[PDB]
RNA sequence: CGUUAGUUGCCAGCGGUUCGGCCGGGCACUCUAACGGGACUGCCCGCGAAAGCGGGAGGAAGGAGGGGACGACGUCUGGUCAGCAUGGCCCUUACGGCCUGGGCGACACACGUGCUACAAUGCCCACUACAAAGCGAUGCCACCCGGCAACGGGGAGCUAAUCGCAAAAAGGUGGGCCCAGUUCGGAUUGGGGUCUGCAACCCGACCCCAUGAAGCCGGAAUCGCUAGUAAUCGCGGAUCAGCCAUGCCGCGG
């Protein structure tokens, strides 16, 4: 059983690059507790459209932090093959835990 | 309503007497979307109809209404001169709207301090026919007729 | 007096409290989000360029 | 031995397990009339049974979360129907006239900017 | 309204205290309206700034609790 | 109600706590 | 039942009835009917004359009340006249004393309304 | 509605339970979130040349299913040189700069927008998992002890579907008030405190005691809203030491 977490602003290149930790610890490894999605945390930003008085008419921005979770139950180094340095993220962060 | 003719909204029947008319009446009683306390009052009033008269609260209520439905009213209409009140026959939907409306309004003017009582007595008083609800009814029938001179417009 | 003021918005102040935020590219005092150091204005600006990562046009 | 449906209504969801027998109905470790106690419209929830004459010849363990009581009541009402037609798929062409099988799409519509409250608009003054 | 200290400007007392070792001064003048009056530091006459000028206020007992700006009002026509 | 601080509802509204609305 | 100063509250619950004294609120009442053990629920009407004295002497010697207050509070304010603290000319002028606006409102402290005109 | 996935979710199915989803056990269900399916005027009747209008079944959804984002050529010489950018003109021992105080918070008056109300479909106290978005490791603060309380000691937990803000309120049940300017309403003022902060006089909010105002539903005018809408009740966030938030942006009952 090994714990890694994966955060990200981008929803597509997480399920992708964490089905990369699926396959690169499936090919070279064994049994998997699959990718489970923690709920997302949306940071809202609401701003009036104008430089000056126009208190109505505003625009709406969000910063959704998608969270995806992946653990696997064979802590071997015949898994940390690709999981050494075989990288296609870009702006994903990783939390390898025990 | 410039476009269609507005489909009259159909009401979920009563959880007791299974009557749509009942619920309608319960809504008119409701205040700030408190249907529970609303229906408590109406039902706990149906209880007062028993403890005092033999008859089933429904047939009281039901026939109490039919005595508060107006048959004619006056709707204004100006011209190239002044504003005149043409007496107009009153369509079935509006009759119910008005009776039920009037019932409650009439009720909450009464003296007894508890919602359930007032609804009851008023219903009861209007079944007999002596209600101040029924005054607002005779007054419109009388406010037509008085303008009978003008029922040659009608639109 | 916007200038002598933008180069005082940076100075470590006598007494903690007198500290205040500021648009990094406005020098703007009011409505400055903590998360960006940006005025509400210069912010709608960048978010539209695309220079504000993961910041989307919120719709629901 | 067992039949089931999922009831939902206005962010309120009901796991509904049916069984034959007796007449009792469990909800979240409580009797019906202790949970929906002194709430007039509760009995609506079981008008599905009262339609098909399933009446109380059924028992029902129901957990439910989301919403407030009167949402749940309509949610359960949907589970009861979505369960007992999964017992008898012929129990459909009689729950159509009453329509006890429709999610009921109505939910809190969004608050809009520059209003107050979605449709409620702020107050005009002209002069 | 405070309870650990009385938060009076220190640069004020130094004047007062060291004016309280045979000291009779009336030309005492300050901008420290933020500072609480203190026990029996009476007799003196502190001129206080109202934002435009200094106000010759004589200090009695009874007013011991209050702050100095309560006696130099900052406006006109009440 | 909502403006008597010494009612529970006056506290709820004000959003505070105390004698007339203590936290369990 | 006469209590403080001259007060004769009657025919309502003592806890409320107590209120009719200058210096008693629902607070100081809750106390007296427990630090002297009297059911608050009971009307003054039906109420022991032994319980009245336990009350009358408690309340009257537990705290400054009714007309002493009135004359303290009044003299307490004319203190703020003194040399002339701010709340002085404020009570002096009859305008809000606890730092609130005055452009609008302040009608409770400024009696009714005295209106004027203006210009062309 | 369907796949994919199981440190959030359960006897739905069985054994221990200090009867708390807490321990194995399990993802069926609820949920969390990615991709799909689905509705199109396709089918039956009716009128029409057609597009399409009235119906009817099937179906979670039927004719734009509901709500957003999206604002044509252009008008108001609309707004903004005070967000920023910029032509010109103007001051350049001062129209630049630094500080300490004061002011933007004034008050005979007048309007806008709101808030709390005038009570019995009501107010007060007690007791009771209805849980649907968000925020928090120079912070959220469980849980202790002191304190009427504000808050102060102490200290657990979580870079947070796991720990905390969390009580949701209207509600249900119990008791109390009995029509009264009242157990309605909480303005004003006296006093005693807490907290943040260099510092709360001008000018902070919060607690507690005392005080308890006008207000009995509002002239002539006039505002919003067509369905989960209006009405009503709480909830969170942004700014932010703190807060004058009853504002604004959202959320659900």
PDB file of C-alpha atoms in Angstrom, chain F residues 1-14:
ATOM      1  CA  UNK F   1     -36.757  40.005  17.911  1.00  0.00           C
ATOM      2  CA  UNK F   2     -33.740  40.367  15.661  1.00  0.00           C
ATOM      3  CA  UNK F   3     -32.608  43.615  17.337  1.00  0.00           C
ATOM      4  CA  UNK F   4     -32.872  42.789  21.002  1.00  0.00           C
ATOM      5  CA  UNK F   5     -29.372  41.549  21.714  1.00  0.00           C
ATOM      6  CA  UNK F   6     -30.674  39.945  24.881  1.00  0.00           C
ATOM      7  CA  UNK F   7     -32.852  37.474  22.932  1.00  0.00           C
ATOM      8  CA  UNK F   8     -31.531  34.281  21.402  1.00  0.00           C
ATOM      9  CA  UNK F   9     -32.736  35.537  17.985  1.00  0.00           C
ATOM     10  CA  UNK F  10     -31.050  38.857  18.506  1.00  0.00           C
ATOM     11  CA  UNK F  11     -27.801  36.990  19.037  1.00  0.00           C
ATOM     12  CA  UNK F  12     -28.312  34.570  16.138  1.00  0.00           C
ATOM     13  CA  UNK F  13     -28.855  37.515  13.817  1.00  0.00           C
ATOM     14  CA  UNK F  14     -26.011  39.576  15.300  1.00  0.00           C
TER      15      UNK F  14
END
